[PDB]
Design an enzyme around this catalytic site. Structure first.
Site, PDB file in Angstrom:
ATOM      1  N   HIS A  60       7.808 -21.905 -82.697  1.00 34.92           N
ATOM      2  CA  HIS A  60       8.353 -22.901 -83.648  1.00 34.92           C
ATOM      3  C   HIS A  60       7.374 -23.054 -84.816  1.00 34.92           C
ATOM      4  O   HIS A  60       7.754 -23.685 -85.816  1.00 34.92           O
ATOM      5  CB  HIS A  60       8.707 -24.245 -82.952  1.00 34.92           C
ATOM      6  CG  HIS A  60       7.445 -24.728 -82.316  1.00 34.92           C
ATOM      7  ND1 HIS A  60       6.929 -24.233 -81.119  1.00 34.92           N
ATOM      8  CD2 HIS A  60       6.578 -25.670 -82.728  1.00 34.92           C
ATOM      9  CE1 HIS A  60       5.787 -24.878 -80.833  1.00 34.92           C
ATOM     10  NE2 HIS A  60       5.566 -25.745 -81.799  1.00 34.92           N
ATOM     11  N   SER A 112       3.076 -26.483 -77.312  1.00 35.33           N
ATOM     12  CA  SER A 112       4.473 -26.808 -76.978  1.00 35.33           C
ATOM     13  C   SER A 112       5.248 -25.595 -76.482  1.00 35.33           C
ATOM     14  O   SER A 112       6.127 -25.656 -75.631  1.00 35.33           O
ATOM     15  CB  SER A 112       5.264 -27.496 -78.115  1.00 35.33           C
ATOM     16  OG  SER A 112       4.515 -28.677 -78.489  1.00 35.33           O
ATOM     17  N   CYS A 131       3.755 -26.559 -87.782  1.00 42.79           N
ATOM     18  CA  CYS A 131       3.562 -27.412 -86.635  1.00 42.79           C
ATOM     19  C   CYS A 131       2.170 -28.091 -86.555  1.00 42.79           C
ATOM     20  O   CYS A 131       1.795 -29.191 -86.984  1.00 42.79           O
ATOM     21  CB  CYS A 131       3.712 -26.669 -85.282  1.00 42.79           C
ATOM     22  SG  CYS A 131       4.036 -27.917 -84.000  1.00 42.79           S
ATOM     23  N   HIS A 160       4.443 -25.230 -73.014  1.00 46.75           N
ATOM     24  CA  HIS A 160       5.123 -26.278 -72.265  1.00 46.75           C
ATOM     25  C   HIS A 160       6.513 -25.730 -71.833  1.00 46.75           C
ATOM     26  O   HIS A 160       6.978 -26.102 -70.750  1.00 46.75           O
ATOM     27  CB  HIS A 160       5.331 -27.578 -73.065  1.00 46.75           C
ATOM     28  CG  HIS A 160       4.084 -28.375 -73.200  1.00 46.75           C
ATOM     29  ND1 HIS A 160       2.984 -28.227 -72.346  1.00 46.75           N
ATOM     30  CD2 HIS A 160       3.756 -29.341 -74.107  1.00 46.75           C
ATOM     31  CE1 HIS A 160       2.053 -29.038 -72.701  1.00 46.75           C
ATOM     32  NE2 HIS A 160       2.467 -29.725 -73.748  1.00 46.75           N
ATOM     33  N   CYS A 162       1.515 -22.468 -80.175  1.00 45.39           N
ATOM     34  CA  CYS A 162       1.220 -23.883 -80.001  1.00 45.39           C
ATOM     35  C   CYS A 162       1.451 -24.242 -78.547  1.00 45.39           C
ATOM     36  O   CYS A 162       2.286 -23.671 -77.806  1.00 45.39           O
ATOM     37  CB  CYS A 162       2.157 -24.637 -81.028  1.00 45.39           C
ATOM     38  SG  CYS A 162       2.263 -26.423 -80.535  1.00 45.39           S
TER      39      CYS A 162
HETATM   40  N1  LIG Z   1       4.288 -34.862 -81.456  1.00 44.56           N
HETATM   41  C1  LIG Z   1       4.385 -33.634 -82.011  1.00 44.56           C
HETATM   42  O1  LIG Z   1       5.151 -33.415 -82.944  1.00 44.56           O
HETATM   43  C2  LIG Z   1       3.520 -32.407 -81.520  1.00 44.56           C
HETATM   44  C3  LIG Z   1       3.344 -31.282 -82.355  1.00 44.56           C
HETATM   45  C4  LIG Z   1       2.516 -30.285 -81.723  1.00 44.56           C
HETATM   46  C5  LIG Z   1       1.979 -30.420 -80.470  1.00 44.56           C
HETATM   47  N2  LIG Z   1       2.267 -31.586 -79.808  1.00 44.56           N
HETATM   48  C6  LIG Z   1       1.655 -31.749 -78.390  1.00 44.56           C
HETATM   49  O2  LIG Z   1       0.266 -32.071 -78.741  1.00 44.56           O
HETATM   50  C7  LIG Z   1      -0.650 -31.547 -77.592  1.00 44.56           C
HETATM   51  C8  LIG Z   1      -1.745 -30.854 -78.266  1.00 44.56           C
HETATM   52  O3  LIG Z   1      -1.441 -29.482 -78.629  1.00 44.56           O
HETATM   53  P1  LIG Z   1      -2.445 -28.267 -78.964  1.00 44.56           P
HETATM   54  O4  LIG Z   1      -1.660 -27.155 -79.440  1.00 44.56           O
HETATM   55  O5  LIG Z   1      -3.517 -28.811 -79.834  1.00 44.56           O
HETATM   56  O6  LIG Z   1      -2.974 -27.996 -77.464  1.00 44.56           O
HETATM   57  P2  LIG Z   1      -4.303 -27.544 -76.805  1.00 44.56           P
HETATM   58  O7  LIG Z   1      -3.936 -27.159 -75.422  1.00 44.56           O
HETATM   59  O8  LIG Z   1      -4.862 -26.562 -77.794  1.00 44.56           O
HETATM   60  O9  LIG Z   1      -5.231 -28.798 -76.859  1.00 44.56           O
HETATM   61  C9  LIG Z   1      -5.333 -29.815 -75.790  1.00 44.56           C
HETATM   62  C10 LIG Z   1      -6.750 -30.162 -75.615  1.00 44.56           C
HETATM   63  O10 LIG Z   1      -6.888 -31.259 -74.646  1.00 44.56           O
HETATM   64  C11 LIG Z   1      -7.925 -30.939 -73.761  1.00 44.56           C
HETATM   65  N3  LIG Z   1      -7.707 -31.628 -72.519  1.00 44.56           N
HETATM   66  C12 LIG Z   1      -6.986 -31.324 -71.412  1.00 44.56           C
HETATM   67  N4  LIG Z   1      -6.972 -32.165 -70.409  1.00 44.56           N
HETATM   68  C13 LIG Z   1      -7.756 -33.158 -70.849  1.00 44.56           C
HETATM   69  C14 LIG Z   1      -8.139 -34.411 -70.169  1.00 44.56           C
HETATM   70  N5  LIG Z   1      -7.713 -34.698 -68.970  1.00 44.56           N
HETATM   71  N6  LIG Z   1      -8.953 -35.161 -70.950  1.00 44.56           N
HETATM   72  C15 LIG Z   1      -9.396 -34.889 -72.159  1.00 44.56           C
HETATM   73  N7  LIG Z   1      -9.074 -33.730 -72.852  1.00 44.56           N
HETATM   74  C16 LIG Z   1      -8.247 -32.876 -72.165  1.00 44.56           C
HETATM   75  C17 LIG Z   1      -8.087 -29.433 -73.643  1.00 44.56           C
HETATM   76  O11 LIG Z   1      -9.221 -28.978 -73.148  1.00 44.56           O
HETATM   77  C18 LIG Z   1      -7.581 -28.969 -74.950  1.00 44.56           C
HETATM   78  O12 LIG Z   1      -8.672 -28.723 -75.921  1.00 44.56           O
HETATM   79  C19 LIG Z   1       0.374 -30.778 -76.663  1.00 44.56           C
HETATM   80  O13 LIG Z   1       0.579 -31.554 -75.562  1.00 44.56           O
HETATM   81  C20 LIG Z   1       1.592 -30.419 -77.539  1.00 44.56           C
HETATM   82  O14 LIG Z   1       2.770 -30.152 -76.848  1.00 44.56           O
HETATM   83  C21 LIG Z   1       3.043 -32.623 -80.294  1.00 44.56           C
HETATM   84  O1  LIG Z   2       5.665 -28.255 -80.972  1.00 45.66           O
HETATM   85  C1  LIG Z   2       6.408 -28.669 -81.791  1.00 45.66           C
HETATM   86  N1  LIG Z   2       6.980 -29.794 -81.376  1.00 45.66           N
HETATM   87  C2  LIG Z   2       6.873 -30.576 -80.159  1.00 45.66           C
HETATM   88  C3  LIG Z   2       7.272 -32.048 -80.548  1.00 45.66           C
HETATM   89  C4  LIG Z   2       7.278 -32.911 -79.299  1.00 45.66           C
HETATM   90  C5  LIG Z   2       8.067 -32.331 -78.115  1.00 45.66           C
HETATM   91  C6  LIG Z   2       7.949 -30.826 -77.896  1.00 45.66           C
HETATM   92  C7  LIG Z   2       8.050 -30.038 -79.228  1.00 45.66           C
HETATM   93 ZN   LIG Z   3       3.926 -27.048 -82.049  1.00 46.80          ZN
END
Ligand SMILES: NC(=O)c1ccc[n+]([C@@H]2O[C@H](COP(=O)([O-])OP(=O)(O)OC[C@H]3O[C@@H](n4cnc5c(N)ncnc54)[C@H](O)[C@@H]3O)[C@@H](O)[C@H]2O)c1
Ligand SMILES: O=CNC1CCCCC1
Ligand SMILES: [Zn+2]
Ligand SMILES: NC(=O)c1ccc[n+]([C@@H]2O[C@H](COP(=O)([O-])OP(=O)(O)OC[C@H]3O[C@@H](n4cnc5c(N)ncnc54)[C@H](O)[C@@H]3O)[C@@H](O)[C@H]2O)c1
Ligand SMILES: O=CNC1CCCCC1
Ligand SMILES: [Zn+2]
Ligand SMILES: [Zn+2]
Ligand SMILES: [Zn+2]
Lengths: 374, 374
Positions: free
Chosen positions: A67, A48, A174, A51, A46
């Site tokens: 995770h 994250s 996740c 990150h 993922c």
């Molecule tokens: N809140 C939570 O509990 C939780 C859980 C999981 C992930 N997240 C966060 O959610 C995000 C998404 O995760 P993912 O695994 O799907 O990631 P990912 O990297 O697969 O997806 C991000 C998408 O955004 C696009 N993108 C990048 N810059 C952009 C811009 N300027 N404008 C428009 N689109 C753009 C990419 O091309 C990519 O497809 C991450 O930032 C992650 O850390 C939060």
């Molecule tokens: O990816 C799983 N969880 C994320 C939730 C928001 C902060 C970073 C960890």
């Molecule tokens: Zn995650």
């Protein structure tokens, strides 16, 4: 056979920021009271976890990240009552202690025993069960699934259905849940509404799945990478727009496209600017915008409060708002029942040892979710 | 007797920012189609009116301010069907066209015909019914109540009960409704919850009253003016705190006092910093914070999005979220029925001509609501 003993196994250690993971030999201590040692079967990569590598998400190093996974309990410490050796389980990055104020609240899910707000990178007791090269290695969100074996607090694990396919249901740990719950539980997407989903990776596609399951009539996918459009359309997006194609700010384009603003917008990228944009694009009087994306540590966004005074609603959530221990098992049951699909998020499958390759595929834009098998 | 004719009367004209109101003779044109000319009976002095004088709230000058009032219809233009000469009415600063997408939405109230987003300072037809010294004077929010006579669009006026006391029910035209609805309709304060209300002026006290009517268990009043505490306690505040009395930031104090953060917080002041503070003081996983205060024109606030990501809900509303034309008449009915009180908000009563005195009392911190009678 290994119960009660220190296990030596392979794990992906992150020694320093912006460095490839180092596949090495670690010693995993036996589970203490209320702890469960799990043998990993599958784990997804993922954003994250990336990150942590890039410094966007701060947590003590060195660390065993990971995770999003599923494994089999290898053994349990004294007192564990919710799982047994042999059970299929999904580690929970957001615990569910069931006794704090949030766990007791009908809408809360961010259990107070989490390791997210002020990361310690350890077990609930303040210590680590991992040793590498003679040094203690930090845990990550009480899960650390980028190892053949891991040790988690009882409140950080959920027993799932014995016949579930671990290489698919790890996404419920996740990605999928976060995405789906954001739409269906936090936003509470309504029938016939218009949605705007910013970021079309694995969580965004799951956001799209929830919107489609809620009855949304229009689901606008937004991404600067046109190669994500196809799969977005496949799980539900009725239209996809790429901000780089327009001469005006994407919020104007979406406001015009939705004839005054969408009902629901979602930021699933992790940028301060798109968080503000996704709020603006939602209808000024009754729109709702949900932040899902994690932005760079310690940075503040800048916004005009009139965006909210007109009536907009702005919110965020961890793991789609779901109380972890109680929904993980149900989400698996529903998956088993074919209530939602996981296959569209899985674009590559690799053996655990090829983890760096999996991170390269995510960073290059080529994959959605790469699943690592042990 | 005056129907169909231009009326000459007194009105408080605001010719320039930061200057006292100018009590002078104005010419009020007869109402055009779908317009209603009202003889003002009473008008309250709300902080938003002061915002026009100070430059906090931008609107075209010169202008006839005032938006919280009650009067009697003097005459109606061709086509009016909802009110008649002699009816008691309350001018609506937030219109209710009943035909736009927001009007038609179950939760929206910020009618698309409003004069708040891009202030024109005119009637719906783009013209003014006021002349002073040979010059056209702008209208304010389609109300302009600081005049003996005003002209409003049919969608900006509500017919109320014939026996209501106009010197009290004018507060339902702004302050009271705004406050009360914010708690009961926008926050949707729950039984047994803990509330934090920042700003104990007229709207703040009405937010308190709504919290008390919703069954909140604790209602903490916050204000840097200790003289506001007494009244706050009288309408429902269970505790009052003055941020100048502590050495630590008020949000830590309130988080400690609520053992982890309040369920509901309200910013009823108009400051960027308090807006962020009120959001932080609300419980990180399920707290809800509502912005009511109007901040200085065009300024952005800075905030960390993790405040939302843990689960907080952040929202704002105009006029406590109420659909204006439908709720005002019901609100008067309920006041007639003794369902809520208005007297506690009224601390001074003055004849219209003493308007500047009334603004002085507000700016000095001495009053809550000064009612101006004609
Ligand atoms: N809140 C939570 O509990 C939780 C859980 C999981 C992930 N997240 C966060 O959610 C995000 C998404 O995760 P993912 O695994 O799907 O990631 P990912 O990297 O697969 O997806 C991000 C998408 O955004 C696009 N993108 C990048 N810059 C952009 C811009 N300027 N404008 C428009 N689109 C753009 C990419 O091309 C990519 O497809 C991450 O930032 C992650 O850390 C939060
Ligand atoms: O990816 C799983 N969880 C994320 C939730 C928001 C902060 C970073 C960890
Ligand atoms: Zn995650
Ligand atoms: N959203 C709406 O529809 C709506 C309707 C009416 C008023 N408003 C706005 O609501 C606000 C409240 O209006 P009011 O008429 O009750 O005004 P007011 O000035 O009587 O009340 C504001 C109160 O906040 C207090 N205060 C000032 N600085 C403070 C600080 N730093 N910390 C804590 N408390 C502080 C004052 O002492 C005062 O009692 C105004 O900004 C007004 O424009 C909004
Ligand atoms: O005071 C009445 N209304 C307020 C509504 C928020 C913007 C300025 C005016
Ligand atoms: Zn808990
Ligand atoms: Zn007002
Ligand atoms: Zn309307």
């Amino acid at each position: 056979s290994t119960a009660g003993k220190v296990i030596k196994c392979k794990a992906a250690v992150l020694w320093e920021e912006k460095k490839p993971f180092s596949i090495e030999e670690v010693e995993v201590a036996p589970p203490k009271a209320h702890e469960v040692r799990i043998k990993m079967v599958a784990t997804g990569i993922c954003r994250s976890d990336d990150h942590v590598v890039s410094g966007t998400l701060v947590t003590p190093l060195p660390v065993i990240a990971g995770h999003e996974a599923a494994g089999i309990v290898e053994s349990i410490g004294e007192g564990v009552t919710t799982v047994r050796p042999g059970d299929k389980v999904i580690p929970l990055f957001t615990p569910q202690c069931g006794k704090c104020r949030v766990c007791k609240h009908p809408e809360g899910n961010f259990c107070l025993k989490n390791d997210l707000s002020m990361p310690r990178g350890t077990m609930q007791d303040g210590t680590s069960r991992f040793t590498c090269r003679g040094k203690p290695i930090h845990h990550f969100l009480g899960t650390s699934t980028f190892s053949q074996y891991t040790v988690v607090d009882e409140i950080s694990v959920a027993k799932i259905d014995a016949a579930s396919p671990l290489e698919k249901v790890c996404l419920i740990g996740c990605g999928f849940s976060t995405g789906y719950g954001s739409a269906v539980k936090v936003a509470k997407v309504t029938q016939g509404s218009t949605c705007a989903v910013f970021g079309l990776g694995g969580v965004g596609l799951s956001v799209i799945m929830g919107c489609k399951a809620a009855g949304a009539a229009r689901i606008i996918g937004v991404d600067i990478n046109k190669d994500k459009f196809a799969k977005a359309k496949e799980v539900g997006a009725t239209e996809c727009v790429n901000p780089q194609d327009y001469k005006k700010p994407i919020q104007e384009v979406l406001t015009e496209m939705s004839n005054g603003g969408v009902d629901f917008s979602f930021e699933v990228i992790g940028r301060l600017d798109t968080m503000v944009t996704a709020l603006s694009c939602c209808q000024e009087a009754y729109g709702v915008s949900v932040i899902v994306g994690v932005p760079p540590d310690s940075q503040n966004l800048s916004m005009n409060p009139m965006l909210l005074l007109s009536g907009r609603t702005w919110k965020g959530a961890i793991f789609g708002g779901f109380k972890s221990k109680d929904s993980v098992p149900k989400l698996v049951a529903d998956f088993m029942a074919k209530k939602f699909a996981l296959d569209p998020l899985i674009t590559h499958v690799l053996p655990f040892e090829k983890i760096n390759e999996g991170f390269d595929l995510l960073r290059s834009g080529e994959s959605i979710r790469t699943i690592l098998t042990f």
